[PDB]
């Protein structure tokens, strides 16, 4: 029932190569719906999901202007931070920004986020109360003082509790066939002789949405942690996700093992057995 909207921005400086590379993406839950790339020729925010293409020219002009502003402030920030930490001009550095909002099963506001990292390390972040900042070091403390003097957190809170959640609800309505759907996984088993006395059972979950899922093995009903192997959930490339879990078993004992599959799109968990 819960839902999320997130914007991710990354700026990487390119010393001796001109302007920093800037890439912005927007997600609703696990579905990307917008993208911007300073290297692309269009210089505009672009649709990545079908339900967002409905928006008219005012939407796209506004989002392009906003993402360009973010690009510009990030490019200023790269130099600002080089100064803060007294770093040379010859190396590459990375600024990342993320913000967004979470709503509950009733689509009411639940959480807000606004975070900055420098060189893969936390720099500054809006605290959970949406009223104050946490700073990772002294440079971030200068940023925090500047933002407190400008009352940034109040404007940010008004954005997160209004525009962010309101347009998330709009997207969830318009993209209902995509965002509000739960594709239960398509599961199957493969079997492979590893040696003349051992076998591998692999349990596949495919084409599920959203990405959260649980695969567990058990032997005669007892959870089987050891002799197993699971891969991280991975995108299929078409908006769905994949995962598998495998266990090595004595040949002739495959019937004792069961693969259990938990997913939101399943009314009850699935149980798969080889024989």
């Amino acid at each position: 029932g819960s839902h999320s909207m997130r914007y991710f921005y990354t700026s990487v400086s390119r010393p001796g190569r001109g302007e920093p590379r800037f890439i912005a993406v927007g997600y609703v839950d696990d579905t990307q719906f917008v993208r911007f790339d300073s290297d692309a020729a269009s210089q505009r925010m672009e649709p990545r999901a079908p339900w967002i293409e409905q928006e008219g020219p005012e939407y796209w002009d506004g989002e392009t202007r906003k993402v360009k502003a973010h690009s510009q402030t990030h490019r200023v920030d790269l130099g600002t931070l080089r100064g803060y930490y007294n770093q040379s001009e010859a190396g590459s550095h990375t600024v990342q920004r993320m913000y967004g909002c979470d709503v509950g099963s009733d689509w009411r506001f639940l959480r807000g986020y606004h975070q900055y990292a420098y060189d893969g390390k936390d720099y500054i972040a809006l605290k959970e109360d949406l009223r104050s900042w946490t700073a990772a070091d002294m440079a971030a403390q200068t940023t925090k003082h500047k933002w407190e003097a400008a009352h940034v957190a109040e404007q940010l809170r008004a954005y997160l509790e209004g525009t962010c959640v309101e347009w998330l609800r709009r997207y969830l309505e318009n993209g209902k066939e995509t965002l509000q759907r739960t594709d239960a996984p398509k599961t199957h088993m493969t079997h492979h002789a590893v040696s003349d006395h051992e076998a591998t059972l692999r349990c596949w979950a495919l084409s599920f949405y959203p990405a959260e899922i649980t695969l567990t093995w058990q032997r005669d009903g007892e959870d089987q942690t050891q002799d197993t192997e699971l891969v991280e959930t991975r995108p299929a490339g078409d908006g769905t996700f994949q995962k598998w879990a495998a266990v090595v078993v004595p040949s002739g004992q495959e019937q004792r093992y069961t693969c259990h599959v938990q997913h939101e799109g399943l009314p009850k968990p699935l149980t798969l057995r080889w024989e």
Binding site: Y99, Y123, V152, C164
Partner: peptide, 9 residues
């Protein structure tokens, strides 16, 4: 949609 901000670190 995004936040219309010119926020500098």
């Amino acid at each position: 949609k995004q936040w219309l901000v010119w926020l500098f670190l």
